[PDB]
Structure formats: C-alpha cells, structure tokens
Design a binder for this molecule. Structure first.
Ligand SMILES: Nc1nc2c(ncn2[C@@H]2O[C@H](COP(=O)(O)OP(=O)(O)NP(=O)(O)O)[C@@H](O)[C@H]2O)c(=O)[nH]1
Ligand SMILES: [Mg+2]
Lengths: 169, 173
C-alpha cells in the first residue's frame, strides 16, 4: 500500500478568531469563538434522546456544577429512582453496562450513563475547563500556537465524540 | 514585632508526584497557584502564622518530590503530616497505604495525619468517590478532607484542621 502522512496546518479563520479571543478572553456565550464551537461541537455533542435531561446536563456543564463519578458493583442499593440504572443509560435510554453516574446540582440525584455519554460529556467539559483556564491568568507557559492547537485537539475529541467515535477504559 | 508566636508546628507534605502538594503549600502560605508547576527539586518549606483557639500557632510547612532519597531528614521532627492523593487518578490513592507505611517507619508514631483529597475542582474526571476515601481514612483513624488548590476550596480548612488537632494534642501532654 502507498504511504499517507499525517499533517497539521492551522486554518487561518479559526486561528485569527482564536487569537482575537486570546487577546481579550471571555466566557460570554455570544463571542464568535465560543459561538461557532457551540454550534458545531457542543450542541450536537450533548444532544441525547431524553433532552430535558440533556439540556439540564448542558447547563450543568457550563455552570460547572456537573459531576461524574464512577459507580462500582453493589448488590444492595437504597432506591428513590428516569435516573436509569446499572442496567440502562439515563440519557440515551438504552440497555448497556453503565460504569458511571452523573449529578447536575450536588444538590441533585444520580443518573446512570453509558461510557459513550461519559466520553462526549467529558469531551465538552475538558474543552470548557481549558477555555476557563485560558480566560483566567492560569496559563502562562504555553505559547499562543500551542494554546491554539490544544483548542483544536479538544474540538477534535468533541468532533469524534459527535459521530459516535469514543474511547472507553 | 510580629512573627512572634506561642507554639510552632512542623507539618510535612507527602503523596505521589503530581497530586498538588506544592500548590497546596503555595495556596496556604502565599495564596498562589501554579497551573504549570514542574516536579519539586530537593526539599522546601514555608511558614504561616494563624490563630488557634486563642493560642498562637505558626505553621512551618514542608514539601518535597513525590517519587533513593535521604528520606529521614524530611520526616525528622515532623509533628504533622499531609498525605496527599489526586481525586482524578486512582493510582495516587492506591499508593496512600504505602505513603502511610513510609510515614510511620521513618517517622513518629503519634504524628497527626490527614487524608487529602486534592484537585476536587475536576468534577467530571473524578476517579475516587468520596465514600471510599472516607471509608479508608475513618477505618485507618485518619482525618479526611477534599481540597482544590486551584480554586482554593478547603485548603485553609484542611491546614486549620490539622493545626487545631496538633495543637489540641500538644495541649494534652
Ligand atoms: N485541576 C487542578 N490541578 C491542580 C491542582 N493542584 C495542582 N494541580 C496541578 O497538578 C500538577 C502537579 O502539581 P504539583 O503541585 O507540582 O504537584 P506536586 O505534588 O508538587 N508534584 P511533585 O511531587 O513532583 O513535586 C500541576 O500541573 C498543577 O498545576 C488542583 O487543585 N486542581
Ligand atoms: Mg512539588
């Protein structure tokens, strides 16, 4: 077979956009930089079949009140359970092993989720936490092109997550 | 004429590399956080005076790299210890028992120990559910708290707990 070489080149529109967001950082939802990523990455990535739960989850993600906890085997459990279970995903509504549980407020009940949902959600969340690090003065040792390519990486992970391409450990 | 005190406690920081010991230290003493901090070279210490049930407590907080080292100068004279793991990396928590072993072989056996409990700010990446670390700590007699040196949560509370407790058990004897 012939050889294909993986290459990487900065799109100048996204790059100038990001550099002009970097020059004056904000978490404001209407800033072009975030708006685009909301439309192309975040919204499709948090789109699930039960969607009041999905929108609650999105709000939880941008409010940083969302928490993801691993749930281990347990023969007995107090039940007030919709919230799904180890049997079934509370987000997509289907029967799969759920090795994770989700909480919106903390200040909320748990919802079991498939590893896939966990992957999408954690993709989005990682993006948000990095962007929040940038918005504050926390990132001082990373060059601008480095920062840019980290944003590209996160958008990569979210893009793959969108289409059903995810990782499970 | 401050930096004048009543009692002086030496607390050491222990745990795997990358759990946030040095940032816990800087957050408590200098209220600084370092997102990009590298691994610690040699040993370091900083001081901060706080006030405890009316009696002056000045804390001399010790810090060193997580991963042979001349291990017994660091522990020597330590009246308190902060055993630190990363909430988002279970392996750091699994090595807690071994940090404990090395905590009382090469150090004092009535040293005050608190389980931490760090990077609580990473909620979506949580590896160690609170119940399991609290089970382990309660069962091992250790006090337990969850901190984020990044967003400052429970840092003051943690240090003040271990300090109040060391103070209290230096009030007894
Ligand atoms: N999200 C988050 N990151 C943290 C927190 N505390 C430390 N970190 C990050 O985790 C990494 C390790 O921190 P550091 O304080 O150097 O750990 P350490 O225990 O001193 N390591 P060493 O044992 O090698 O000296 C750094 O990237 C630091 O910014 C925290 O509360 N939250
Ligand atoms: Mg260090």
């Amino acid at each position: 077979q012939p050889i294909v070489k993986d290459c990487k080149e900065a799109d100048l529109s996204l790059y100038n956009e990001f550099r002009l967001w970097k020059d004056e950082p904000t978490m404001d939802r209407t800033c072009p930089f975030l708006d685009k990523i909301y439309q192309e990455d975040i919204f499709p990535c948090l789109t699930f079949s039960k969607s009041e739960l999905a929108s609650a989850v999105l709000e939880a993600v941008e409010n940083n009140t969302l928490s993801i906890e691993p749930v281990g085997l347990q023969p007995i459990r107090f039940v007030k359970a919709e919230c799904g279970g180890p049997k079934k995903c509370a987000l997509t509504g289907q029967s799969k092993s759920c090795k994770h549980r989700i909480k919106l407020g903390d200040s909320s009940n748990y919802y079991y989720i498939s590893p896939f949902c966990r992957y999408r959600i954690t993709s989005v969340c990682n993006f948000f936490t990095y962007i929040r690090y940038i918005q504050q003065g926390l990132v001082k040792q990373q060059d601008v092109d480095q920062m840019f390519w980290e944003v590209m990486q996160l958008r990569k992970e979210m893009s793959l997550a969108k289409l059903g391409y995810f990782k499970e450990e | 004429a401050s930096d004048e005190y009543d009692y002086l406690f030496k607390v050491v920081l222990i745990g795997d590399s990358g759990v946030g010991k040095s940032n816990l230290l800087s957050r408590f003493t200098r209220n600084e956080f370092n997102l990009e901090s590298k691994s610690t070279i040699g040993v370091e210490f900083a001081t901060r005076s706080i006030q405890v049930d009316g009696k002056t407590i000045k804390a001399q907080i010790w810090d060193t790299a997580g991963l042979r080292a001349i291990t017994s100068a660091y522990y020597r004279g330590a009246v308190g210890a902060l055993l630190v793991y990363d909430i988002a990396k279970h392996l750091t928590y699994e090595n807690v028992e071994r940090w404990l072993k090395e905590l009382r072989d090469h150090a004092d056996s009535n040293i005050v120990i608190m389980l931490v409990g760090n990077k609580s700010d990473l909620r979506h990446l949580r590896a160690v559910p609170t119940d399991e670390a609290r089970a382990f700590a309660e069962k091992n007699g250790l006090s337990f708290i969850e901190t984020s040196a990044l967003d400052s949560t429970n840092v003051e509370a943690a240090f003040q707990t271990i300090l109040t407790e060391i103070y209290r058990i230096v009030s007894q004897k």
